[PDB]
Each structure stands twice: as C-alpha cells, then as structure tokens.
Amino acid sequence: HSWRHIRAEGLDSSYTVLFGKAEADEIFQELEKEVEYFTGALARVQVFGKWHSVPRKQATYGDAGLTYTFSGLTLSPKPWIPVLERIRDHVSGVTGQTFNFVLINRYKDGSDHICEHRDDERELAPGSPIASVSFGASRDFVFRHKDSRPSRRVAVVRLPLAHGSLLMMNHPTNTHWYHSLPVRKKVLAPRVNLTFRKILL
DNA sequence: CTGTCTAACTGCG
DNA sequence: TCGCAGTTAGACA
Numbered sequence: 491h492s493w494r495h496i497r498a499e500g501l502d503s504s505y506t507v508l509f510g511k512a513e514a515d516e517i518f519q520e521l522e523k524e525v526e527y528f529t530g531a532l533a534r535v536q537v538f539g540k541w542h543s544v545p546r547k548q549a550t551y552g553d554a555g556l557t558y559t560f561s562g563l564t565l566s567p568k569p570w571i572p573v574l575e576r577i578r579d580h581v582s583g584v585t586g587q588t589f590n591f592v593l594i595n596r597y598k599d600g601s602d603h604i605c606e607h608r609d610d611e612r613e614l615a616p617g618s619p620i621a622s623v624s625f626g627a628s629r630d631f632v633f634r635h636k637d638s639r640p641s642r643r644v645a646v647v648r649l650p651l652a653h654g655s656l657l658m659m660n661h662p663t664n665t666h667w668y669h670s671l672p673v674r675k676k677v678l679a680p681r682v683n684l685t686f687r688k689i690l691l
Numbered sequence: 692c693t694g695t696c697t698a699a700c701t702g703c704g
Numbered sequence: 705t706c707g708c709a710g711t712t713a714g715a716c717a
C-alpha cells in the first residue's frame with residue numbers, strides 16, 4: 491500500500507519499499523549465497539553486429555520447459571529455490587499478479603550496467619506487468635520515451651531503486667518507453683535485481 | 692531490396 | 705563524472 495505512482499504519456503509504473511533494512515539484508519545474503527549465474531557462452535549477446543560479454547551477471551529461474559530470448563541469447567530457467575519462491579510469493583500476495591519466471595541481474599558495482607532496451611519479446615503474456623525487486627546498493631534507473639531520440643520530446647524519468655524495493659512496470663509502459671541502468675562509478679557495492687515475468691507456454 | 696531496429700561498445704566533449 | 709554520437713564479426717519483415 492501507498493505506492494509512488496510514476497505516470498507519463500504511455501508510462502504507467504509504481505514504486506514501493508517492501509522490506510526494512512534487517513529483512514532485506516537477510517534476503518540479500520541468501521541471494522548471494524544461493525543464486526547460480528550463467529557463464530561463458532550463456533553470458534554473451536549480439537548487439538550492433540558484434541558479440542559482447544555482458545557487463546554484469548544474469549540468471550533465470552522458473553517453471554520447467556520454459557525459455558527466454560533477447561539479443562541472440564536463449565536462456566533456460568533453473569528450477570525454483572526457496573529464497574526466490576519466498577520473494578515471488580510476497581510480490582504475488584501484494585500485487586495479486588502471478589509469475590512463472592524470474593530474470594536475475596547482478597551488478598557487482600557501478601561499473602556494471604545494462605544498456606537501454608525494451609523488455610520486448612512476444613513470448614511474454616500480453617498485458618501482464620513486470621515486477622522488479624532490488625537488493626543491495628541503490629542504483630539509478632532511467633526511463634526514456636521511444637520517439638525522443640527526436641521528433642516530439644517527452645522528459646526522461648529518473649528514479650533511484652533502493653534496497654528491498656519493488657518497481658512495477660505495468661502495460662503499456664514497455665511498448666512506449668526504453669529503460670537502462672546507467673554506469674555510476676561512485677557505487678562500490680553489489681546490487682541484485684529480480685525482474686519477475688509471466689511467460690507463455 | 693528497402694527500411695527499421697539493435698539489452699553493446701569506443702571515443703570522445 | 706556523466707552521457708552523447710555513431711554505430712553494425714547485423715537480423716529481420
């Protein structure tokens with residue numbers, strides 16, 4: 491309850507803190523201890539004709555048989571684990587929404603980042619929201635309008651994502667706006683992000 | 692065969 | 705420290 495509502499032209503989102511420091515610290519430790527990340531061949535993507543190692547670590551968990559694909563990289567979900575189930579069920583019991591898949595991004599520090607994109611693929615249940623839960627260091631998250639890089643120019647939306655926070659990205663946000671987690675060199679500590687989604691069978 | 696798009700980078704300013 | 709400009713060991717419709 492008591493969400494901060496992020497609203498603009500074709501942008502509907504909401505931000506809330508889910509946990510206090512003591513709890514979120516406990517979940518963060520467990521994530522650090524328990525999550526396994528893809529390496530080598532499953533850590534490379536194809537963008538602008540070139541193959542790049544990703545500047546971060548990624549993991550996927552979810553219901554058996556599923557798959558997710560972005561930028562010429564196809565990831566297969568590992569079976570659920572308690573710490574992840576715990577978070578999922580908490581987000582479910584607060585939003586009403588259900589989820590069968592989570593992508594985990596770990597930025598060891600402000601050098602690690604994700605370039606701007608739309609969480610795009612049609613393998614994603616249409617109309618469904620995306621649940622972004624963040625642990626560890628606060629990191630600036632940035633929204634930017636599609637046609638703004640620039641015919642008619644809507645203002646960029648900056649937002650800090652805190653320890654134990656939840657960002658909800660409701661439809662139609664992801665058709666209209668791009669998002670990135672830009673480099674911040676002042677940031678020395680790790681951060682783990684869990685974006686929960688609903689995937690089609 | 693044309694045009695729209697790119698979850699990433701270097702090399703700047 | 706930040707982020708813009710210009711992408712392209714090109715994909716795809």
Ligand SMILES: O=C(O)CCC(=O)C(=O)O
Binds near residue numbers: 604609624631685
């Ligand atoms: O790091 C985040 O806050 C979200 C990362 C992201 O954009 C994604 O999981 O696709």
Ligand SMILES: [Mn+2]
Binds near residue numbers: 607608609669
């Ligand atoms: Mn994303």
